[PDB]
Ligand binder design. Structure first.
Ligand code: FMN
Ligand code: LD8
Length: 334
């Protein structure tokens, strides 16, 4: 099973709590995170993009770096881990993304990939008046499809003449071309989404579900595996969890309750037994060995190729995972 880290590109990571570690997303923090991750043989790092926050006492995700520049910087200070940036396709022309990815390919030596995102919240895009109306809700995938087609032309051959409803290319050039085949990623959960993933993505990101119910996401992995049958393409699931670990189950449970107790509820309304303190993320709470066991249970779901991990505390989380969780995991004995 592959393991990656979901790097905090917004403040306070994935906890909306006054009891959660409070920190700003800085390059040097992310640098320290990816370098630790690389040290413990994590396979990849991924940064979302978030163009607007949810306010509140903690000002959750009001401070957010830009993904392609953050990963170009992380690329220049790592050597082995895989680096994925997220392009919000409404805000960047495909030809630019294409060139940006060639560029981070050059920095990283073939370690870069791109995570293509529709955009879901209207506020992110209306705020800068580029949201294309409510037609987009059920037509993003038609848009995304033309988009990916321009990228493939440019990475593939270095030119594109694509003519569709949304883009017009007239001998568009982009060289150099990526030194390796350019990995693309998607995180659609809908039928459209999976359909897209199966055609063009190299793996699909889905959400873990429940506290301490590791294999609860299995349906969606099964659905993603079904959608992949329809294109004959090997397109695995990579599931997002928050790990809250400790030396014992009681200890870890105590951290978890502590976080949920300090919920920033003003910030939680703007968004609107799992807790919304991590946006109802799938969470594994327990001792190092409890958590190792549950991840072993994740590696055994059909479709599951890897997990994408957040922590309550990234620097110690990545360390405890490296030192105490990983080496008890069957699925990581290589
Ligand atoms: C690991 C992961 C990362 C994601 N990153 C982003 C992101 O960076 N930006 C974003 O707008 N949405 C992001 N999403 C949300 C999805 O792109 C998507 O909108 C959602 O899961 C619903 O699926 P659909 O688009 O097929 O309806 C992410 C989802 C997952 C599982
Ligand atoms: C948990 O991370 C998530 C979840 C949902 N949507 C986004 O980005 C918009 N990020």
């Amino acid at each position: 099973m592959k393991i990656g880290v979901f790097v905090p590109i917004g403040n306070n990571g994935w906890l909306i709590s006054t009891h959660a570690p409070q920190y700003m997303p800085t390059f040097e923090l992310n640098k320290a995170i990816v370098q630790k991750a690389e040290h413990y043989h994590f396979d990849f790092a991924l940064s979302m993009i978030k163009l607007r926050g949810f306010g509140g006492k903690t000002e959750f995700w009001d401070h957010n770096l830009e993904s392609f520049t953050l990963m170009a910087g992380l690329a220049a200070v790592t050597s082995r881990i895989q680096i994925y940036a997220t392009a919000a396709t409404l805000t960047l022309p495909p030809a630019i993304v294409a060139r940006m990815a060639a560029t981070i390919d050059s920095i990283s030596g073939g370690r870069f990939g791109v995570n293509l995102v529709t955009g879901w919240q209207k506020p992110e895009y209306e705020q800068m008046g580029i949201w294309p109306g409510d037609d987009y809700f059920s037509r993003r995938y038609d848009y995304l499809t033309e988009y990916v087609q321009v990228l493939r032309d440019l990475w593939g051959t270095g030119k594109s003449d694509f003519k569709g409803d949304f883009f017009t290319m007239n001998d568009c050039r982009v060289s150099p071309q990526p030194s390796v085949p350019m990995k693309v990623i998607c995180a659609g959960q809908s039928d459209a989404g999976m359909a897209f993933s199966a055609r063009y993505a190299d793996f699909n990101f889905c959400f873990g579900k429940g506290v301490n119910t590791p294999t609860a996401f299995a349906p969606t992995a099964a659905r993603m595996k079904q959608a992949a049958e329809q294109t004959g393409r090997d397109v695995g699931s990579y599931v997002l969890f928050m790990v809250i670990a400790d030396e014992t189950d009681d200890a870890a449970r105590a951290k978890w309750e502590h976080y949920k107790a300090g919920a920033d509820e003003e910030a939680l309304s703007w968004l609107t037994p799992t807790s919304a303190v991590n946006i109802n993320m799938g969470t594994l709470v327990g001792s190092y060995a409890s958590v190792a066991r549950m991840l072993d249970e994740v590696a055994s779901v059909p479709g599951a190729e890897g997990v994408l991990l957040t922590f309550d505390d990234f620097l110690s989380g990545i360390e405890t995972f490296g030192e105490r969780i990983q080496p008890l995991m069957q699925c990581r004995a290589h």
